[PDB]
Amino acid sequence: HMRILVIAGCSEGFVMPLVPLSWALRAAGHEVLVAASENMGPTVTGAGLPFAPTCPSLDMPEVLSWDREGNRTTMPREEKPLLEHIGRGYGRLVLRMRDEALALAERWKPDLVLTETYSLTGPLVAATLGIPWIEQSIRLASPELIKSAGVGELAPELAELGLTDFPDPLLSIDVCPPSMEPGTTKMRYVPYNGRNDQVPSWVFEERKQPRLCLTLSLLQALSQELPKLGFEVVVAVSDLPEGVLAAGQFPLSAIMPACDVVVHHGGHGTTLTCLSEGVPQVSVPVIAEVWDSARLLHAAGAGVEVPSVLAACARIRDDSSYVGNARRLAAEMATLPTPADIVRLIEQ
Template identity: 40%
Template sequence: MKVLVNTGPAHPLFFPLVPLAWALHAAGHHVLVATPESFEPVVRGAGLRMAPVYGPLDMGEVMGRDREGNRLRVPDSEEEMADGVGCGFARLAVRTLEPTVELVGSWRPDLVIGESYSFASAAIAAAVHGVPWVKHTVGPGDLPVTAALARELAPELKEHGLVEMPRPDLVLDNCPPLMGGPAPDTTPVRYVPYGEPGVVPDWALRPGVRPRVLVTLGSVQPQIGGLPALAEMLAAVAELPVDLVVAVADHLVPGLGPLPANVIAAGWQSLTAVLPGCDLAVHHGGPGTMMACSFHGLPQVIVPGRGKPLDEIRRLAATGAVTEVPPAELTPHALRDACRTLLDDPGRRERARALRDHIAEQPSPLRVVGVLEELAAAR
C-alpha cells in the first residue's frame, strides 16, 4: 500500500503523525510525506521520505497576513482564534494545493492521511483523484477550523468541482477518554510521543538524588513578563529540595542570568529524551507537551498559554494528576507551592501513573494499520 502523509511545516502538526508513519512503514507499506521543502530536515530526521509541495515557507507569515499580504490583527477571543487559524491554514493550502493534486495524480497513493489543521490540500487532492483520506488529530483541544477553511477556499473548491470541503473517510483521534476523546464517529489511536532524535543528556540516564523538575515553557510566556519574571519563578521553585531542569530555547538561556546551584539550564531538549528522567513537569499547556508528560506518568503544573486547550487541562486537573495555575494567579510563591503539593502527595503521583496506564489502553498505531488497510482495500 502507498500512503501519502500530508502535514504543515510545524513540529506540533507533524510529530503526532510520525508513530503512525513508522507503523505503516514497519508493516511493509510505502510512506511519503508531502510538505513544503523548508521542513525537509525535520522529515529527514524522522527517517521518512518526503516530496516537497511548495518551496521555502515561513509559517508566521502565512498565518499573520491575508492573501494580499496585509498584516492581520491578533484575535481577541477563542472563537476568533479558531476562525483566524482556519483561514491561515487555508492560505497555506492555496500554496500547496496544486502541487499536492499533481502529486496524488502521479504517485497514485492508495490512501492519504492529513493532520487536523493543514489537511485541506490533502482532502481536495484525494477527492479529485478518488482516493480515500484520513484525518489524524494532533492532540487534545483541536480547534474547529473546517468552516473557516471552506469559506476561505471557496474559489479553489469551485475550481476543482467541489461544493464543500471533502469529508474524511476516517478520523483517527489520539485524545484519550479521560481528556474528552475520542470524539463521536472517530477511531481511537494511542498518543505516542515523538521527538527529534539526538543524544540523551547524561543526567537524564541516572536516577536523581532528589526529585527532578522539568520546566519547559516553550519560548517566553508573555503572561509572566518575559525572562526576568521566568528567572524569579525558577528561583522560587529552586528553594524546594529538588534539581530543576530548565528546557527553553538555547538563545534564551543567557537572559536568565545567574541561577541557583540546583538549576540546570539545559537549553532546548527533546521531551522524549528527558521526560523519563524527571519526576514533575512545569509547562504552558501545549497539547504535545501535555500528552507527552501524561504518557510518561508525570504529575504536571500547567500555566496555560494563550489558545491552549483549557477544557482538557481542567479535565486532567480533575483527575488529580495536574495542577492548573491560571496566568492571572501566577506568582513565584504560587508556582513553588503548586510544585511542592504535587511532589509531597503520593496520591498525586499515583493518579499520574493511572493516567499513563489509561493512555496505554488505547489502540496502538500498529493496531490501527489494519484499519487503514481495510479502508484502502474497500475503495
C-alpha cells in the first residue's frame, strides 16, 4: 500500500498521458492524488481521478513569454536556442506551482511522486521532502536540451536544498518503440484521449471506403478538399461538406480502428495513439518540442511529416508501405511492458 502524488502540467496533452499509469497504481490498491493547475481539474476528474489544484488557471504561453525578471521574451528561430527557451519556460512553470504543491505534499504525505519529464515541480517537491520520484516520458522523443535548460533555470531553488541537480528518479520510463530510436525502462503506451463518449455508430459498422480522420479555413479547407482524393472524412474536434461523415469530438482512441489515415497537428498523444493503433499518419507539426517525434516518425516510414498535405495523403493512400510500417510499430509497442507491469516494478 502506497501514497502517490501525481504532479502534472497545465495543458491536457501533458495531463492525460499520465492517466493510465495513475489508474494502474490505483488498480494495484495504491492511493493516488493528481495535482495540477486549477484549469486541469475537469480533465483529471473526467478521467475518474482525484484532483487538487497547485496554482490558478494557466496556459504555457503565459509563462513562456516572460522571464524571471518580468521581461518579455521572444522565440529563437534556430532550433537549439529555441529548445533552451522552451526549457526555461517549463522551469518557470515550477515557480507558479511549487508553493501549493509542496504544502499539499506536507499535508498529504506521499511516499512517491509520479510526474512527466518536463513537469519539474515533481522532482523538486520530492527532493524537498526526501522521497523517491518516478519519471514518465509522454513523447516519442524528449530533447535533453529542454530538461537541462529547465534544471538550469531552477538553479536558485535547488541551492536552497543544497543541490545543483535533481536527485535521480527511482524509475525513468520511456514509450518510444526500440526500433525507432538510457537508464530507462520501456513501457507500452496505453492511449487516453477521452472526456465524454459514445463510440458512434459507424465505428462499429462497416467501412465501404478509405477513411481519414483530421483532428479562411485550414480545418474547413482540408475538410472539403480531402474527400476528393477518395477519402470519407471524419473530423474529431471540439469546434457539412459532402465527403465528411461526422462532426464533433470523438473518443479518438476508440474511433481509431475505424480509419486508414490520420492527418493531425503533430501532438505527442495523437502521434503515440496512431502508432499504437497501427494507423499511418500525416503530421503537420506546429509546436517545436514535437519536431523530434515527427522526424522519428517520418524516418520509420509510418507516416509523412509536412513541415502539400493532400500530396501526403494520396501518397499514403497508394503506398501500402505506410500501413505496413505503422502496424509493425504498433505490434512492436504491444510487446512492451504494460502500465500494470511497471507498477510491479515500482513497488519493488
